[PDB]
């Protein structure tokens, strides 16, 4: 009847400006299921959906943290309607900083979040997908899983893990009528690179005058790029709406053709040694 | 005075074969320190080391588990001369099966080991290759980091983890001296593939019949790919000695031409569509 769709990290950004812009939908279509690690950051997912004023019964949230399977599986459960048309994989951790600057635990975490809690979700909604012979998944990717970024090292392995993860799983589903996309997303204007890095006194505490000279230099040319470049969330939002209504959907789906140039780089020399060369020029 | 070159998982494989052949070295250019998760492993690393007769002190064994930092910082210490001139990140754990076919620990052991373990080297080593302004970082890659395969989700997200990696600490590295190579490796014989997939008792149990049928269908495309393009660890391992031995080694060295083809055709159909109807049918 209506399109049942589950959401991961809908406390801000993209996750959130989703759930309510499908919410929300003049059509009444979508069925939307937000789910957010804490409750207590709930309170702009529900301003919010005042302000576009969703009708009631439009938005349920759940509490789920994708680094806990039992809780994947207790918001499974909370689905009454017993199926998800559209499963979204947005909950994403971000890490910015020199790589000896980084804790172990800091660097885990990400790893488990933004790979293994995809993967998660995945076992844990999949198999019924196959079983119905139907079902949509789309995935936040960047730009920084397509290209890797100085002091974006972890991260980076992050995002480029999700096209490796993603891919993977597409040429296995392609005969089972399960649709697997990536939203690839370049800087989103939203509440982003925040307490994703350490203070200057406990960065330079943790690495040489040079490297974080560089560091510096890098988030000076990164203020720019953003500034230059830096796309709304209802913008992105657009985007996962054109994969999620498209007949056929292709694996990847782009929210700017701006970095396109910059990719094509990477990819016609094998070696990396153009990409690497040119960022490196790009960025300091 | 000689290079001094730690490498680790030298238990089996392309680094076994490549802590023996730097050995070994008729010009004796080469302290070896070959690390290995567990000693009672080492009988292999010492057999060939007497096959190539290496000269008594070319090749020292530690014990290090790249998912325990204190190991890492333990066989760091063990290293007498005080500098490390190649540092070779080798170690690496395999995944294969169907996605929800996979135990959360397994899933979460690979990206400790293949990622999160090269990150503790990479911490532990880097800080002082940069403040001598000199080293050679050489990391084990995969065709499997380029693209995506059905049923090796988990290791591709690794693998793909690992460019992510090395691509973003190429660009800050390039002015520091030190220099970091992907040495990416096609399918290698050596002893692969082995209890890196369960039972197929165990395997039915985790999927569905048409999924296991396709496992099966994907089992037997990759033995024949295997018997028709798998190279010798000593043909890999002088591909190692290649970007070690360059006066201005690139990111990424391959250890064939042979996938390149298919390569191709990812990066200029960024959308995905056409490489994941290739492989779908390449394999199936
Ligand atoms: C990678 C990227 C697209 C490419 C951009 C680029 C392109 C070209 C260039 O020359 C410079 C730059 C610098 C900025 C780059 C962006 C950073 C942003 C990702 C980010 C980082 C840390 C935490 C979070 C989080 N909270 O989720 C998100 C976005 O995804
Ligand atoms: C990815 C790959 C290169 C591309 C190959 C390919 C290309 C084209 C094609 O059509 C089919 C296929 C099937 C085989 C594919 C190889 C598998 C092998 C990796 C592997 C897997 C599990 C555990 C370990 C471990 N113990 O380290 C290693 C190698 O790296």
Redesign the interface.
Known sequence: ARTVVLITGCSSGIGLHLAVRLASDPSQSFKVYATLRDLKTQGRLWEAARALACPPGSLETLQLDVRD?KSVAAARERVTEGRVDVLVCNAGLGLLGP??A?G?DA??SV??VN??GT??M??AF??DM??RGSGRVLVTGSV??L????????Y?????????????????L???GVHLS?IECGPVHTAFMEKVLGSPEEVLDR??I??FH?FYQYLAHSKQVFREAAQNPEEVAEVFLTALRAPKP???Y?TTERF?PL?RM???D????N???A??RE??
Do not use: I, W
């Open positions: 399977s790589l000896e980084l172990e660097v885990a790893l488990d790979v293994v993967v998660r995945l076992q999949l198999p196959k079983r920084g899983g290209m890797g970024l100085p002091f974006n090292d972890v980076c392995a992050s995002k480029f893990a999700l096209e490796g993860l993603c891919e993977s799983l597409a040429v296995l392609l005969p089972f990536l690495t040489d040079h490297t560089r292709t694996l990847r782009f396109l990719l990477r990819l016609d094998p070696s990396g040694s990409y690497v060369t960022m490196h960025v300091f």
